[PDB]
Amino acid sequence: LPSLDLLTPPTFALEQMARLVEARLADFRIKADVVNYSPGPVITRFELNLAPGVKAARISNLSRDLARSLSTVAVRVVEVIPGKPYVGLELPNKKRQTVYLREVLDNAKFRDNPSPLTVVLGKDIAGEPVVADLAKMPHLLVAGTTGSGASVGVNAMILSMLYKAQPEDVRFIMIDPKMLELSVYEGIPHLLTEVVTDMKDAANALRWCVNEMERRYKLMSALGVRNLAGYNEKIAEADRMMRPIPDPYWHPVLKKEPYIVVLVDEFADLMMTVGKKVEELIARLAQKARAAGIHLVLATQRPSVDVITGLIKANIPTRIAFTVSSKIDSRTILDQAGAESLLGMGDMLYSGPNSTLPVRVHGAFVRDQEVHAVVQDWKARGRPQYVDGITS
């Protein structure tokens, strides 16, 4: 419902660089040809043809030096270019382009998608808009260093939803233990409860979810339904026929249930003080919340084996890595290097559950002010109908 006008509107140098890359590469016992290259908004991917035997892991363990052999902040070595037998070398463009939220929001890919948890990621290395469905993730983990784009990235996601879902479609439980990052959304009618600030309430909020999931699963059985979607259609049906479905377990009639998106900003604070208990709850939720319409988003900027633990990783299939400071950090996030080779400012590596190959995406950009604009627009439509007990 809010308007898009609340958001701002959107070969020689190459071959020379291709020739220097081939020169710096041959500068070692690495013979390779730059058979091709494709330029995008932020980087340019050079396709190298390694000589017989030359492992693609040989360049990867030399990205730092190589990036230094030329004048670029960093260089990313993609071991496998989908569809081609060549190795990829991503270099930053001299003139970078901003990827505007609005440009992706105004695309068919976002417009056509029926899911209310559709989110804009950004654009792929070739300039194509990338959208994703939180419902299909079905839970996500966002991580990076401080100003690499995680926060802006999360805002892009929520705004995505605020540009397609009515509260009846999606409700949020926002956990911001420390500071006020998510506090900017206070008042949004979508909020199920006030932004959670006490670390103990957080645990309670999660426990609520766990029960809300069993409740929804009970109902789904009574109607012989598999998804939350199938349940709502049964309910829509009952509505069209003015044949209200009375609660089979109990005046009182069943109603449409919204998707609940649980957002935890810097769940590191949640771990470094209530870790064990939280992990316990996250794991249970992440295992069966999908069909029940409950989805987790865990954001952090302190990617450590203490935060992104084994269990956490084992329960959150989809992960997003914004620029990190080291390979270790990246591996903790993606169980694979690469994110320490991004160019900051929204540059990211998406890693879904249905593939081992990560995908580079330049995150959409949203002004802190546009967030306020969008939030003000939503609060004018009315205040949130809080649900009691979530925090108690």
UniProtKB/Swiss-Prot annotation:
Residues 1-7 have a biased composition (Low complexity). It is found in: Cell inner membrane. Induction: Induced by DNA-damaging agents. It comes from the Bacteria. ATP binds at G147, S148, G149, A150, S151, V152. Residues 127-331 form the FtsK domain. Essential cell division protein that coordinates cell division and chromosome segregation. The N-terminus is involved in assembly of the cell-division machinery. The C-terminus functions as a DNA motor that moves dsDNA in an ATP-dependent manner towards the dif recombination site, which is located within the replication terminus region. Translocation stops specifically at Xer-dif sites, where FtsK interacts with the Xer recombinase, allowing activation of chromosome unlinking by recombination. FtsK orienting polar sequences (KOPS) guide the direction of DNA translocation. Homohexamer. Forms a ring that surrounds DNA. Interacts with FtsZ, FtsQ, FtsL and FtsI. Belongs to the FtsK/SpoIIIE/SftA family. This is DNA translocase FtsK. It comes from Escherichia coli (strain K12). The chain holds residues 840 to 1248 of 1329 of the full protein.
